[PDB]
Each structure stands twice: as structure tokens, then as C-alpha cells.
Amino acid sequence: MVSKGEELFTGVVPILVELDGDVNGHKFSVRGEGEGDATNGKLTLKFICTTGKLPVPWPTLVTTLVLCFSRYPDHMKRHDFFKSAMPEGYVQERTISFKDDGTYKTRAEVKFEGDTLVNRIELKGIDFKEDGNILGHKLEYNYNSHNVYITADKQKNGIKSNFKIRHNVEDGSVQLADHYQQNTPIGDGPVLLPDNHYLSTQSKLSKDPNEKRDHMVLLEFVTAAGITHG
């Protein structure tokens, strides 16, 4: 182990996710539960919309709804910022610009509460078009595999990332979601600032046949790569 935080991820860890959202004034909430295992890079989560119908497509919230569960290979352990911030945790902030449509602004705290890894999120969505791909629910219930590049932010004592997500549209087009991300430690403790690398992601979206509430079952594998050795 090369951080104190890394010791908290040697096994399966239960997860709680809480989002409070407002998109074009439509207020909604989501809660998720499941578990993460950073030893194999695997997350399993089930999310419900606690307020009724989700006013945005579930795929648009996948990135917002725990990168501490990324599998960092043995040779890359000194580049794992996310676990190094634990248990105090980190703030994850994004701007998500939907091409030709509105913007999500997010702020999340990811930290241990008890033995649970908690991701608690506020989301504000602005300038969405009523007849767009988002408020119109024109996005396919699926999710493309993606590489996300991680850089150190020495000033903020954390990391930053920009990346584009490609959401398939029912009419065969693609809706781009341009992500700008920064992560900053909550705690005063020392953290690992990484060399340039990327995270390889794969997300499978499904439904619980016994679940009548508006919901998303998520299986996510995230693996770090891109460092030649060390």
C-alpha cells in the first residue's frame, strides 16, 4: 500500500449515492445503493428517482452518479489520487456542456460515512431545450466505452479531467456531453498527485424487472492505464 486511503479498498465496499437536482426548474432526487471493489475495478449500483419520473435521461447522469473504485495496476498505485484522499474524501465538481443544448453544473462530496462510501451530489441544469435530446428523452438506454484522461492540478492539490461522452440518439445521431472536471481533497492530509494517465471505462445499463419506480441498474468497470512503469 502507498497511501493510508488505499487500505480502505482491499475488499468490497458498500456505496450510497444521493443526488438532488434541478433541470430548467424541474426538481428531482435520485438515491443509489450497491457496492464497489477497486481490486477488480467493478461497481454495481441500482438508482431510483425518489420524486417520480426522472425529467432527464438516465444515461446523462451516469458520470455524475465514485472513481476511488478504479482499478489502479500495481505499477500505478502512486498515481491514485482518489483513494489517497480517503477517508476524509474529495470534492468532485463538473460542468457538463450538452452540444447545442443545456449545461449541468455538479458538486459532489465522495467520502466514507461509517463503513459506507457516499457520493452526495447537487446538480443544477440550465438552458435545456424543451424539444432537445435531453428534456425530450431521445437518448438510447445504453452507454459507450470511453477513456478519460487524468492530470494533476498542483494549485488545487488535486486532479482535473476534460472529456466528451457520446450519447446515442434514437434517430441514429450522437449527442455530445463535454465534461470539465476538478477534484480537491476535503481533508488536510497528504494526497498523491499523479503523472498523466487515463481511465478506461465500460458501463452496462439495465432494468430490474420487479422495480416499478423509474430506475437504472448500472454495472461499471474502470481501470487505470497509460503509465510505462511506476
mmCIF file of C-alpha atoms in Angstrom:
data_model
loop_
_atom_site.group_PDB
_atom_site.id
_atom_site.type_symbol
_atom_site.label_atom_id
_atom_site.label_comp_id
_atom_site.label_asym_id
_atom_site.label_seq_id
_atom_site.Cartn_x
_atom_site.Cartn_y
_atom_site.Cartn_z
ATOM 1 C CA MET A 1 0.000 0.000 0.000
ATOM 2 C CA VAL A 2 1.364 3.502 -0.941
ATOM 3 C CA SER A 3 -1.457 5.577 0.726
ATOM 4 C CA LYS A 4 -3.448 5.175 4.028
ATOM 5 C CA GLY A 5 -6.646 5.589 1.908
ATOM 6 C CA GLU A 6 -5.707 2.638 -0.350
ATOM 7 C CA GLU A 7 -6.080 0.319 2.777
ATOM 8 C CA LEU A 8 -9.884 1.119 2.798
ATOM 9 C CA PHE A 9 -10.308 -0.508 -0.674
ATOM 10 C CA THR A 10 -8.703 -4.012 -0.221
ATOM 11 C CA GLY A 11 -12.214 -5.609 -0.412
ATOM 12 C CA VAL A 12 -15.856 -4.974 -1.445
ATOM 13 C CA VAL A 13 -17.146 -1.630 -0.064
ATOM 14 C CA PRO A 14 -20.835 -0.699 0.181
ATOM 15 C CA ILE A 15 -21.885 2.527 -1.559
ATOM 16 C CA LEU A 16 -24.629 5.126 -1.118
ATOM 17 C CA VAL A 17 -25.375 7.812 -3.747
ATOM 18 C CA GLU A 18 -27.680 10.791 -3.131
ATOM 19 C CA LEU A 19 -28.388 13.415 -5.827
ATOM 20 C CA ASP A 20 -30.575 16.497 -5.563
ATOM 21 C CA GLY A 21 -31.220 18.030 -8.973
ATOM 22 C CA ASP A 22 -32.921 20.974 -10.689
ATOM 23 C CA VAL A 23 -33.045 20.993 -14.543
ATOM 24 C CA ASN A 24 -34.770 24.060 -16.041
ATOM 25 C CA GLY A 25 -36.564 24.325 -12.655
ATOM 26 C CA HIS A 26 -37.774 20.634 -12.700
ATOM 27 C CA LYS A 27 -36.660 19.480 -9.192
ATOM 28 C CA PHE A 28 -35.831 15.764 -8.747
ATOM 29 C CA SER A 29 -33.880 13.432 -6.453
ATOM 30 C CA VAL A 30 -32.062 10.135 -7.008
ATOM 31 C CA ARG A 31 -30.751 7.623 -4.496
ATOM 32 C CA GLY A 32 -28.493 4.679 -5.324
ATOM 33 C CA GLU A 33 -27.026 1.765 -3.450
ATOM 34 C CA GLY A 34 -24.707 -1.152 -4.182
ATOM 35 C CA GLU A 35 -21.025 -1.899 -3.858
ATOM 36 C CA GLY A 36 -17.577 -1.221 -5.309
ATOM 37 C CA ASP A 37 -14.368 -3.308 -5.498
ATOM 38 C CA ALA A 38 -11.247 -1.376 -6.511
ATOM 39 C CA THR A 39 -9.240 -4.675 -6.521
ATOM 40 C CA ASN A 40 -11.157 -5.703 -9.743
ATOM 41 C CA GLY A 41 -12.457 -2.246 -10.836
ATOM 42 C CA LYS A 42 -16.134 -3.341 -10.611
ATOM 43 C CA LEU A 43 -19.121 -1.208 -9.427
ATOM 44 C CA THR A 44 -22.719 -2.500 -9.181
ATOM 45 C CA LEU A 45 -25.350 0.171 -8.340
ATOM 46 C CA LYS A 46 -29.131 0.492 -8.532
ATOM 47 C CA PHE A 47 -30.573 4.036 -8.678
ATOM 48 C CA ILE A 48 -34.155 5.147 -8.200
ATOM 49 C CA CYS A 49 -35.773 8.531 -8.896
ATOM 50 C CA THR A 50 -37.336 9.192 -5.441
ATOM 51 C CA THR A 51 -39.526 12.078 -6.801
ATOM 52 C CA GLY A 52 -41.334 10.074 -9.557
ATOM 53 C CA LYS A 53 -40.355 10.352 -13.247
ATOM 54 C CA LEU A 54 -36.750 11.433 -13.937
ATOM 55 C CA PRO A 55 -37.054 14.615 -16.104
ATOM 56 C CA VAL A 56 -33.730 13.799 -17.912
ATOM 57 C CA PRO A 57 -32.462 10.543 -19.483
ATOM 58 C CA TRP A 58 -30.690 8.187 -17.055
ATOM 59 C CA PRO A 59 -27.569 7.929 -19.344
ATOM 60 C CA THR A 60 -26.932 11.727 -18.924
ATOM 61 C CA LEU A 61 -26.436 11.172 -15.137
ATOM 62 C CA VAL A 62 -24.046 8.108 -15.274
ATOM 63 C CA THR A 63 -20.832 10.229 -14.949
ATOM 64 C CA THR A 64 -22.389 12.297 -12.100
ATOM 65 C CA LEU A 65 -23.755 9.292 -10.118
ATOM 66 C CA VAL A 66 -17.005 7.148 -7.494
ATOM 67 C CA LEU A 67 -13.586 6.958 -9.229
ATOM 68 C CA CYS A 68 -11.987 5.720 -5.925
ATOM 69 C CA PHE A 69 -13.217 2.266 -7.171
ATOM 70 C CA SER A 70 -10.965 2.449 -10.304
ATOM 71 C CA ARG A 71 -8.539 -0.487 -10.589
ATOM 72 C CA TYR A 72 -5.040 1.080 -10.450
ATOM 73 C CA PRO A 73 -2.490 -1.553 -11.578
ATOM 74 C CA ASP A 74 0.346 -2.347 -9.073
ATOM 75 C CA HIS A 75 2.842 -0.184 -11.060
ATOM 76 C CA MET A 76 0.405 2.809 -10.989
ATOM 77 C CA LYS A 77 -0.550 2.755 -7.249
ATOM 78 C CA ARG A 78 1.404 6.010 -6.565
ATOM 79 C CA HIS A 79 -0.854 7.801 -9.161
ATOM 80 C CA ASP A 80 -4.204 7.033 -7.415
ATOM 81 C CA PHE A 81 -5.353 10.461 -6.148
ATOM 82 C CA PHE A 82 -8.917 9.265 -5.430
ATOM 83 C CA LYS A 83 -8.094 6.615 -2.767
ATOM 84 C CA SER A 84 -5.305 8.819 -1.274
ATOM 85 C CA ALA A 85 -7.946 11.409 -0.211
ATOM 86 C CA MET A 86 -9.867 8.742 1.810
ATOM 87 C CA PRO A 87 -11.419 8.531 4.296
ATOM 88 C CA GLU A 88 -11.871 12.355 4.559
ATOM 89 C CA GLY A 89 -12.777 12.226 0.836
ATOM 90 C CA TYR A 90 -12.758 14.711 -2.087
ATOM 91 C CA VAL A 91 -14.991 17.262 -3.822
ATOM 92 C CA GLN A 92 -15.814 16.363 -7.442
ATOM 93 C CA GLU A 93 -17.097 19.306 -9.482
ATOM 94 C CA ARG A 94 -18.086 19.324 -13.136
ATOM 95 C CA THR A 95 -19.520 21.437 -15.885
ATOM 96 C CA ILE A 96 -21.257 19.157 -18.482
ATOM 97 C CA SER A 97 -21.998 21.097 -21.730
ATOM 98 C CA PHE A 98 -24.557 19.248 -23.924
ATOM 99 C CA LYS A 99 -23.727 20.228 -27.541
ATOM 100 C CA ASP A 100 -26.498 22.521 -28.960
ATOM 101 C CA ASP A 101 -28.374 22.148 -25.611
ATOM 102 C CA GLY A 102 -28.135 22.938 -21.876
ATOM 103 C CA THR A 103 -25.430 22.552 -19.186
ATOM 104 C CA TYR A 104 -25.256 20.553 -15.888
ATOM 105 C CA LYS A 105 -23.190 22.074 -13.043
ATOM 106 C CA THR A 106 -22.403 19.489 -10.348
ATOM 107 C CA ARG A 107 -20.762 19.444 -6.939
ATOM 108 C CA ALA A 108 -20.274 16.167 -5.083
ATOM 109 C CA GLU A 109 -18.593 15.027 -1.924
ATOM 110 C CA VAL A 110 -17.194 11.482 -2.026
ATOM 111 C CA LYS A 111 -16.207 10.232 1.426
ATOM 112 C CA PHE A 112 -16.673 7.463 3.981
ATOM 113 C CA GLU A 113 -19.704 7.807 6.317
ATOM 114 C CA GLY A 114 -19.279 4.909 8.706
ATOM 115 C CA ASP A 115 -18.033 1.976 6.569
ATOM 116 C CA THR A 116 -20.021 3.255 3.523
ATOM 117 C CA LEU A 117 -18.524 5.167 0.560
ATOM 118 C CA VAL A 118 -21.026 8.020 -0.020
ATOM 119 C CA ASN A 119 -21.328 10.181 -3.139
ATOM 120 C CA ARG A 120 -23.635 13.127 -2.250
ATOM 121 C CA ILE A 121 -24.343 15.402 -5.263
ATOM 122 C CA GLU A 122 -26.039 18.708 -6.052
ATOM 123 C CA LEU A 123 -26.846 19.202 -9.771
ATOM 124 C CA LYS A 124 -28.165 22.369 -11.479
ATOM 125 C CA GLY A 125 -29.241 22.054 -15.151
ATOM 126 C CA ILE A 126 -29.744 25.238 -17.224
ATOM 127 C CA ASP A 127 -30.693 26.250 -20.805
ATOM 128 C CA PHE A 128 -32.110 22.920 -21.903
ATOM 129 C CA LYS A 129 -34.373 22.960 -24.985
ATOM 130 C CA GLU A 130 -37.890 21.537 -24.287
ATOM 131 C CA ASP A 131 -37.667 19.720 -27.689
ATOM 132 C CA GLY A 132 -33.957 18.733 -27.305
ATOM 133 C CA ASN A 133 -32.475 15.219 -26.904
ATOM 134 C CA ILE A 134 -32.371 15.627 -23.056
ATOM 135 C CA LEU A 135 -35.799 17.073 -21.949
ATOM 136 C CA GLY A 136 -37.333 15.209 -24.972
ATOM 137 C CA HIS A 137 -35.953 11.807 -23.796
ATOM 138 C CA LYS A 138 -34.431 10.986 -27.258
ATOM 139 C CA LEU A 139 -31.318 9.175 -25.883
ATOM 140 C CA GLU A 140 -30.926 5.376 -26.166
ATOM 141 C CA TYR A 141 -30.680 3.450 -22.849
ATOM 142 C CA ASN A 142 -27.044 2.397 -23.394
ATOM 143 C CA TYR A 143 -23.510 3.711 -22.812
ATOM 144 C CA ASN A 144 -20.304 3.778 -24.889
ATOM 145 C CA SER A 145 -16.885 2.622 -23.561
ATOM 146 C CA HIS A 146 -14.570 5.629 -23.068
ATOM 147 C CA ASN A 147 -11.038 6.694 -22.000
ATOM 148 C CA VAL A 148 -10.912 9.646 -19.557
ATOM 149 C CA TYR A 149 -7.533 11.446 -19.208
ATOM 150 C CA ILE A 150 -6.378 12.443 -15.670
ATOM 151 C CA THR A 151 -3.909 15.315 -14.990
ATOM 152 C CA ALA A 152 -2.575 16.703 -11.693
ATOM 153 C CA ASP A 153 -3.726 20.198 -10.571
ATOM 154 C CA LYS A 154 -0.833 21.235 -8.252
ATOM 155 C CA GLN A 155 -2.649 24.570 -7.333
ATOM 156 C CA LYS A 156 -5.829 22.804 -6.072
ATOM 157 C CA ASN A 157 -3.770 19.897 -4.624
ATOM 158 C CA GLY A 158 -5.910 17.536 -6.752
ATOM 159 C CA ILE A 159 -6.750 16.381 -10.312
ATOM 160 C CA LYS A 160 -8.576 17.702 -13.394
ATOM 161 C CA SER A 161 -10.049 15.998 -16.479
ATOM 162 C CA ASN A 162 -11.864 17.087 -19.621
ATOM 163 C CA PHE A 163 -13.614 14.521 -21.809
ATOM 164 C CA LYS A 164 -16.526 14.150 -24.230
ATOM 165 C CA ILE A 165 -19.229 11.486 -23.690
ATOM 166 C CA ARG A 166 -21.082 10.267 -26.826
ATOM 167 C CA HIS A 167 -24.773 9.553 -26.064
ATOM 168 C CA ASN A 168 -26.541 7.571 -28.866
ATOM 169 C CA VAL A 169 -29.778 9.353 -30.036
ATOM 170 C CA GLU A 170 -32.889 7.336 -31.111
ATOM 171 C CA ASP A 171 -32.630 8.921 -34.620
ATOM 172 C CA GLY A 172 -29.077 7.478 -35.147
ATOM 173 C CA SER A 173 -27.315 10.803 -34.345
ATOM 174 C CA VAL A 174 -24.963 11.362 -31.365
ATOM 175 C CA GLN A 175 -25.486 13.874 -28.521
ATOM 176 C CA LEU A 176 -22.060 15.068 -27.214
ATOM 177 C CA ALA A 177 -21.651 15.911 -23.488
ATOM 178 C CA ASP A 178 -18.412 17.892 -22.916
ATOM 179 C CA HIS A 179 -17.209 17.288 -19.303
ATOM 180 C CA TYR A 180 -14.861 19.596 -17.371
ATOM 181 C CA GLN A 181 -13.950 18.031 -14.010
ATOM 182 C CA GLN A 182 -11.881 19.048 -10.957
ATOM 183 C CA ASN A 183 -11.318 17.028 -7.747
ATOM 184 C CA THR A 184 -9.990 18.549 -4.473
ATOM 185 C CA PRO A 185 -9.333 16.869 -1.107
ATOM 186 C CA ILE A 186 -11.782 17.561 1.759
ATOM 187 C CA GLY A 187 -9.155 16.538 4.402
ATOM 188 C CA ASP A 188 -5.876 18.398 5.294
ATOM 189 C CA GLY A 189 -3.862 15.137 4.871
ATOM 190 C CA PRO A 190 -1.270 14.500 2.127
ATOM 191 C CA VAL A 191 -2.531 13.081 -1.229
ATOM 192 C CA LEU A 192 -0.980 11.509 -4.359
ATOM 193 C CA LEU A 193 -0.753 13.880 -7.350
ATOM 194 C CA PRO A 194 -0.440 11.668 -10.430
ATOM 195 C CA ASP A 195 1.585 11.666 -13.628
ATOM 196 C CA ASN A 196 -0.557 11.930 -16.799
ATOM 197 C CA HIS A 197 -2.626 8.771 -17.343
ATOM 198 C CA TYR A 198 -6.150 7.645 -18.328
ATOM 199 C CA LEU A 199 -9.038 5.567 -17.006
ATOM 200 C CA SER A 200 -10.632 3.001 -19.331
ATOM 201 C CA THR A 201 -14.356 2.748 -18.532
ATOM 202 C CA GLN A 202 -17.199 0.369 -19.567
ATOM 203 C CA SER A 203 -20.830 0.850 -18.370
ATOM 204 C CA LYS A 204 -23.783 -1.534 -18.833
ATOM 205 C CA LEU A 205 -27.263 -0.105 -18.147
ATOM 206 C CA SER A 206 -30.203 -2.414 -17.371
ATOM 207 C CA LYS A 207 -33.587 -2.647 -15.615
ATOM 208 C CA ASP A 208 -34.779 -4.587 -12.502
ATOM 209 C CA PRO A 209 -37.909 -6.490 -13.737
ATOM 210 C CA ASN A 210 -39.541 -6.273 -10.221
ATOM 211 C CA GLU A 211 -38.865 -2.476 -9.976
ATOM 212 C CA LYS A 212 -41.886 -0.281 -10.892
ATOM 213 C CA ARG A 213 -40.152 3.025 -9.934
ATOM 214 C CA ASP A 214 -38.144 4.957 -12.559
ATOM 215 C CA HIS A 215 -34.694 3.391 -12.114
ATOM 216 C CA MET A 216 -31.287 2.426 -13.556
ATOM 217 C CA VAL A 217 -29.179 -0.653 -12.831
ATOM 218 C CA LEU A 218 -25.504 0.104 -13.550
ATOM 219 C CA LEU A 219 -22.504 -2.222 -13.937
ATOM 220 C CA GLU A 220 -19.261 -0.184 -14.375
ATOM 221 C CA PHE A 221 -15.639 -1.379 -14.770
ATOM 222 C CA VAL A 222 -12.961 1.331 -14.531
ATOM 223 C CA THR A 223 -9.257 0.564 -14.986
ATOM 224 C CA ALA A 224 -6.279 2.950 -14.925
ATOM 225 C CA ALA A 225 -3.679 2.698 -17.718
ATOM 226 C CA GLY A 226 -1.138 4.703 -19.721
ATOM 227 C CA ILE A 227 1.979 4.735 -17.398
ATOM 228 C CA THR A 228 5.004 2.858 -18.925
ATOM 229 C CA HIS A 229 6.086 1.554 -15.449
ATOM 230 C CA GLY A 230 5.835 3.273 -11.996
#
